[PDB]
Amino acid sequence: MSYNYVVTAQKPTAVNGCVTGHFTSAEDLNLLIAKNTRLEIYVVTAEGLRPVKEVGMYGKIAVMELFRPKGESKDLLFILTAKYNACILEYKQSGESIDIITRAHGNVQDRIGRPSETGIIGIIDPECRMIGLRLYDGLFKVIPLDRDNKELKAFNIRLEELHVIDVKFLYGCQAPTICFVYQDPQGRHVKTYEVSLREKEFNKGPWKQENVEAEASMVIAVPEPFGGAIIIGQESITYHNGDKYLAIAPPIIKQSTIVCHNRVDPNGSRYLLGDMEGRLFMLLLEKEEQMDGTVTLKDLRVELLGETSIAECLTYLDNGVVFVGSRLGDSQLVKLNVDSNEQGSYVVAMETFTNLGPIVDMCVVDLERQGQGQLVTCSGAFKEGSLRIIRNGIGIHEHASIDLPGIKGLWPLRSDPNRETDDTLVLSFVGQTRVLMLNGEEVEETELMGFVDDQQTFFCGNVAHQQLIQITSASVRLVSQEPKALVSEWKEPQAKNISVASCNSSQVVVAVGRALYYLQIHPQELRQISHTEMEHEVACLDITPLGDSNGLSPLCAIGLWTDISARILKLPSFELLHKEMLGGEIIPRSILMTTFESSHYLLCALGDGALFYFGLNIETGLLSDRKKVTLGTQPTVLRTFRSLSTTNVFACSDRPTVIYSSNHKLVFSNVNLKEVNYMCPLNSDGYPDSLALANNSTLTIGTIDEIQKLHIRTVPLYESPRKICYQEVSQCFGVLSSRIEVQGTTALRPSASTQALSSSVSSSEEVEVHNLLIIDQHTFEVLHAHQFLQNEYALSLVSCKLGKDPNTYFIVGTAMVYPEEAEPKQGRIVVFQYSDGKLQTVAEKEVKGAVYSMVEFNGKLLASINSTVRLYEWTTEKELRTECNHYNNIMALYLKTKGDFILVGDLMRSVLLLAYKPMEGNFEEIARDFNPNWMSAVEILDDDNFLGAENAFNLFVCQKDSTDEERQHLQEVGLFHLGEFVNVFCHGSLVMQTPTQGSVLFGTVNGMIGLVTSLSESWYNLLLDMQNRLNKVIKSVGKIEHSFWRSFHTERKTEPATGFIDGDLIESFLDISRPKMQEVVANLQREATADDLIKVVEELTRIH
Ligand SMILES: COc1cccc2[nH]ccc12
Ligand SMILES: COc1cccc2[nH]ccc12
């Protein structure tokens, strides 16, 4: 009945866990990072983190642990998903082919059980005898480790202690032994059990239970020679081991709860600890010797090292380097120094990694140009709180601009053999060449002895033996550097025109119609080595040297007229190594051999905007795994450039693009420029690390931004942003924020709300103090901060005009929060006017509850207050006055409107459709969803389709059912397990303003950004069929079924997804092998071809 398409615009960025070990090989040190559904694998080096392989799971990663059974040469990886998919994984590399293989898998869900409270815990014994899982209170699930247990069959042990806080397997025990903290009415306790595989039961543990701190929260199992356990609490750190017990209560940890630990030394001599304010501690275990040669713990000490991002996890990586994995802020690499600095920190940040999460609110604004949407998010929490401004495509920063029409090519040149930077830019035109010299930022015409100015240049550059080369339509000219003289000139035997040229430092290949000539550059000599006659006219050439080649190519890449071939030829023989026919009647225009992330590719652009690319074996010349993207509608010219120590390809067309690599796949990102015809890198004194760009009229020089799909600007607030709205008439944002103060109350640090240009107050981890920030849309400076009342929490924000009043106001809805109130019984609506650098209060209305949500509605103000939805009019006396009320809610948390229709999202009874009835001045309840759902966000897709997100990470779509009692039942016609928690939906697009209609973005807790759009039945059916066929050919990590992953799942209900296409799966079509493609298309509704589908999937990827 309803047809929706959901796709990832930004993958989750928050770090949910991190481990180290030897996964990729015995000798490698790896960091593995879990970002919800993604697993990232790195090799740790001296340079830092080298990415080797990233994969998606069809599940939320809940457990991730490396372990090494006997009879394994390197670590295996245990993953458990939130839907109880268990797997054992092995890394396997053969060639440039990397696979994660599933060694064992099965689902370990029980029929009876509600999830525990400190969540899923999975632990592995040091001796690899078993995996232990705490999934439900009162049960401990054991998976015997045994290479024959490939289905990961398990048994449950009754656990007497119902409320386990944390649990680990101990080192140095004769039988597998767990150590855990649990809570009963008599307080918190630490206890141990042995786990008997024979008996499938617990046995008495090696040491008796002890009482621990009331807030003991984490168990650390200390390796030999210490053995035993460390128990971290809020006020205390204790060690336990047999008839051995040691406790410290260091005041330095008491300010903030410690929430993560990491072992620095293999023998447990030192641990890192991180708290909720980003403090980083070293915990140091002092050894005591014994006559029998055992080692016992003499003492524990804690030292403050400094401050990091608020850490979800810490991993020491050797050589003083720590990876700080953050959920609430940016992740980091930090370095620990033996000696402190001028402020006393031992911690020095080396590198910062972008985390958008949590995205708690966002909005779309055409900040810079019309039709070019940017997303502005409220991101992070506490000291990590920020605005993030997200926009598609790569920017150029223009530093020079010269009027100079009709450029046909650009080449940079080093005219001085003693200087490393370019000093010369050579320009081609129809029938002509011009040379520009660069003196600082000055750019002047000039002649260059040796070069001719009265032929068109096809190539010029530095070549071997301190020489320059110019290849024109007439000849190849070889020029000495000092002085500039012609030292050798090559012409075709009858002086026919050169039609195509390619050149590296020591080799030249020129075409003359169908003929090819191969020259070598020697001292004062162009040496003709070989020639051939191609079957057809030559369209394009390349001899870019790849690999450990010494600047020499054994290969010549060629594109031909007529058969539209790309071929790899051997030099010097010109023997055909490999031929690919590209199809059509439109010739190749640009061909390039290139290397990305150490793999070799052949790129070939046609004049219609198509780019084909292939893997290239530089040994055999074999092309493989053809793929095709469309880069425009005009001839593309390809050119290599370096930025930030990486080689990329710039593609000039009507739509300039950078081609680059990410996770060993080619990626394409728009450059934010009008049409570019030609470019070259340029690295001169006055224009370091730059690009020269030409169109029909202009020559530009500038620098390029980071090569990435999305550009992110960060605005640190140093406090928690909560909501955002844009006020066009003021050219600013309003942002609700809260900061923590300690009980007067005292701030922990300066932040946006205490550092505004001007400030105002309302007149009447200890306390939240709430503020409305006014933020400039261009500088993101905090222009003004208005502070609310003590214990007043700001929940809702809108910028709008009301009634016949021409002013635009910021309107804020609040709650008065008191400790023993089940919910708030009091709050305000406050109308503010931003004028002359400050907020003035124009009006207030006290209400008897929390103002959760507000929306402008037809010149009126719609607000949700506890269990009520209310519409206010703005009177001539500038007051809000109730028009009508709706009462039939539990807790009305979310509103959206369209026309006279109102979608209401409830705490627990899903969604409800109201209509305002303009001839009766009241609401009519049209229909509601009688299926209970715990809502997190709502959106109206159109008059008949309503989108919900709920707390168990599902989407659904409701429609009207086409009695009166029947018409009042909304039908859930779409269901989809997204696997993210949606905080906000908002209509809009990051793509400059079709198989899809409409555009709704959403932001999530993990910093994932997604898009929802609508499909026709026809499109839905085709794509559903594609999914089903894709799911047969794709091998999933852990052998999870896609249909299982995407099934709607709450504690009440599991059902197959319906009415939803998984765009991430569809887009993965462009990454499968061609045998697989063919397989996917066999008999698919005329009979579709691979290439039809490749086209269809491209149209789809363009919507984000
Ligand atoms: C369930 O345990 C296994 C599965 C797969 C491979 C393994 N190697 C040693 C134990 C093991
Ligand atoms: C090491 O790489 C990361 C870790 C955490 C977040 C990240 N964002 C971009 C890269 C990245």
From Swiss-Prot:
Q: Domain of life, per the record?
A: Eukaryota
Give the result of W934A, as annotated.
Answer: Impairs interaction with AMBRA1, ERCC8, DCAF5 and DCAF11
Task: Spell out which residues are annotated as carrying N6-acetyllysine.
Answer: K1039
Extract the InterPro entries matched here: Beta-prop_RSE1/DDB1/CPSF1_1st, Cleavage/polyA-sp_fac_asu_C, RSE1/DDB1/CFT1/CPSF1, WD40/YVTN_repeat-like_dom_sf, WD40_repeat_dom_sf
Annotated region WD repeat beta-propeller B: where?
392-708
Spell out which residues are annotated as carrying N-acetylserine. Answer: S2
Annotated region (WD repeat beta-propeller A), positions in chain: 13-356
Q: In which pathway does it act?
A: Protein modification; protein ubiquitination
Q: In what way is this protein post-translationally modified?
A: Phosphorylated by ABL1. Ubiquitinated by CUL4A. Subsequently degraded by ubiquitin-dependent proteolysis.
* Keyword terms, alphabetized: Acetylation, Biological rhythms, Cytoplasm, Disease variant, DNA damage, DNA repair, DNA-binding, Host-virus interaction, Intellectual disability, Isopeptide bond, Nucleus, Phosphoprotein, Repeat, Ubl conjugation, Ubl conjugation pathway
**Region of interest (WD repeat beta-propeller C), ranges:** 709-1015
As for subcellular location, the record says:
Cytoplasm; Nucleus
GO molecular function, a single term: cullin family protein binding
Region annotation Interaction with CDT1: where it falls in the sequence: 2-764
Query: Which residues does this entry mark as bearing Phosphothreonine?
Result: T1089
Might you name a Gene Ontology BP term for this protein?
A: negative regulation of apoptotic process
State the residue spans of region: Interaction with CDT1 and CUL4A.
765-1104
Recorded hits in Pfam families, A to Z, give: Beta-prop_RSE1_1st, Beta-prop_RSE1_2nd, CPSF_A
Q: What is known of its domains?
A: The core of the protein consists of three WD40 beta-propeller domains.
Q: How does it assemble?
A: Component of the UV-DDB complex which includes DDB1 and DDB2; the heterodimer dimerizes to give rise to a heterotetramer when bound to damaged DNA. The UV-DDB complex interacts with monoubiquitinated histone H2A and binds to XPC via the DDB2 subunit. Component of numerous DCX (DDB1-CUL4-X-box) E3 ubiquitin-protein ligase complexes which consist of a core of DDB1, CUL4A or CUL4B and RBX1. DDB1 may recruit specific substrate targeting subunits to the DCX complex. (Microbial infection) Interacts with Simian virus 5 protein V.
PANTHER family under this entry?
A: DNA REPAIR/RNA PROCESSING CPSF FAMILY
Noted disease = White-Kernohan syndrome: An autosomal dominant disorder characterized by global developmental delay, variably impaired intellectual development, hypotonia, and characteristic facial features. Some patients may have genitourinary and skeletal abnormalities.
Similarity remark = Belongs to the DDB1 family.
Q: What the protein does?
A: Protein, which is both involved in DNA repair and protein ubiquitination, as part of the UV-DDB complex and DCX (DDB1-CUL4-X-box) complexes, respectively. Core component of the UV-DDB complex (UV-damaged DNA-binding protein complex), a complex that recognizes UV-induced DNA damage and recruit proteins of the nucleotide excision repair pathway (the NER pathway) to initiate DNA repair. The UV-DDB complex preferentially binds to cyclobutane pyrimidine dimers (CPD), 6-4 photoproducts (6-4 PP), apurinic sites and short mismatches.
Name under which the protein is recorded: DNA damage-binding protein 1
Q: Which organism is it from?
A: Homo sapiens
